[PDB]
Amino acid sequence: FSFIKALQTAQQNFVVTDPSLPDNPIVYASQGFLNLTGYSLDQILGRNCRFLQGPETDPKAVERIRKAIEQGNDMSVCLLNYRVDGTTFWNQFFIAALRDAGGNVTNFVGVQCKVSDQYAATVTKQQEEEEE
Amino acid sequence: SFIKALQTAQQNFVVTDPSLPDNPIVYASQGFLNLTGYSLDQILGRNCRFLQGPETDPKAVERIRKAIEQGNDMSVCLLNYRVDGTTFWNQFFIAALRDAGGNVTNFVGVQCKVSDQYAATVTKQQEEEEE
Numbered sequence: 001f002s003f004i005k006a007l008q009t010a011q012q013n014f015v016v017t018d019p020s021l022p023d024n025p026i027v028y029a030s031q032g033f034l035n036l037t038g039y040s041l042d043q044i045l046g047r048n049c050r051f052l053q054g055p056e057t058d059p060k061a062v063e064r065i066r067k068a069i070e071q072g073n074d075m076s077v078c079l080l081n082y083r084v085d086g087t088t089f090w091n092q093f094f095i096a097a098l099r100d101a102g103g104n105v106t107n108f109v110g111v112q113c114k115v116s117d118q119y120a121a122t123v124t125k126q127q128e129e130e131e132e
Numbered sequence: 133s134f135i136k137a138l139q140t141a142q143q144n145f146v147v148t149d150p151s152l153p154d155n156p157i158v159y160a161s162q163g164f165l166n167l168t169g170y171s172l173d174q175i176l177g178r179n180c181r182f183l184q185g186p187e188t189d190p191k192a193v194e195r196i197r198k199a200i201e202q203g204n205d206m207s208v209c210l211l212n213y214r215v216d217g218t219t220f221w222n223q224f225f226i227a228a229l230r231d232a233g234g235n236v237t238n239f240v241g242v243q244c245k246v247s248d249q250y251a252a253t254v255t256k257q258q259e260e261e262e263e
């Protein structure tokens with residue numbers, strides 16, 4: 001199944017990046033990503049998604065995503081991300097590596113879900129208890 | 133719904149209930165039954181580890197075990213066993229479903245049968261994460 005078509009239909013917040021390009025930049029973003037983050041598309045295309053990060057983002061959470069990308073692994077993390085206006089929100093984030101029939105990573109899709117503080121407390125706790 | 137999406141897409145997948153002991157299957161798609169050869173009576177109310185066998189990489193299974201311990205999404209390529217003992221390469225994905233309060237309510241696991249060439253490529257990268 002097209003996971004992307006599934007996300008389009010469900011009108012989710014997601015982006016697709018191209019690892020064949022230096023620094024793995026956004027080459028597609030849904031309307032949902034734009035509404036959520038406040039960015040317009042010319043602000044987002046061709047950029048690494050790390051702009052979503054800021055001073056209050058947990059760097060160990062970011063490392064999980066980094067490893068997942070190095071391994072062509074699917075993963076999820078709850079971390080804090082930044083809107084175009086500098087304000088934060090909690091992101092239940094998911095990333096998938098898409099592979100061809102030959103097994104080679106061809107793209108990444110990242111899905112963003114806004115969650116409450118209460119939600120984040122629970123998930124971040126198990127993340128910190130994982131880190132310790 | 134991730135589950136409604138998998139239904140529509142006619143995927144091979146299961147949903148388990150971690151609120152019951154040993155986190156048993158409480159739903160299995162038709163795709164899953166076709167793939168593994170299991171019937172619904174043999175698997176409903178059971179834990180998925182029956183898919184594993186002697187030639188499965190115990191390190192891939194461990195990768196799956198941590199995801200459940202942490203309530204994380206993950207994907208692994210490992211060898212699984214059908215109801216008659218034959219093997220197939222499984223590009224597996226597991227997701228934790230959470231309520232609004234952040235509590236894991238379910239696990240969803242999706243199985244995609246892949247070629248020897250595919251498994252070769254991915255499993256090599258899995259093995260390479262030695263140090």
Ligand SMILES: Cc1cc2nc3c(=O)[nH]c(=O)nc-3n(C[C@H](O)[C@H](O)[C@H](O)COP(=O)(O)O)c2cc1C
Nearest residue numbers: 015016017048049050052053065066108109110112
């Ligand atoms: C498809 C895709 C989507 C991503 N989405 C997010 C995101 O929503 N929020 C975030 O903080 N990082 C996201 N990332 C991670 C960053 O782009 C980047 O990989 C992260 O900073 C790790 O790289 P670095 O340590 O070199 O900065 C995403 C990565 C990819 C490939």
Ligand SMILES: Cc1cc2nc3c(=O)[nH]c(=O)nc-3n(C[C@H](O)[C@H](O)[C@H](O)COP(=O)(O)O)c2cc1C
Nearest residue numbers: 146147148179180181183184196197239240241243
């Ligand atoms: C929803 C779900 C689907 C699973 N699917 C598979 C699978 O397809 N193949 C597999 O080898 N293990 C699968 N597992 C993992 C086993 O069910 C079990 O969690 C794993 O063997 C580790 O648990 P254990 O330490 O008790 O053996 C799945 C687990 C869950 C929760």
Ligand SMILES: [Cl-]
Nearest residue numbers: 003096225242
């Ligand atoms: Cl998927």
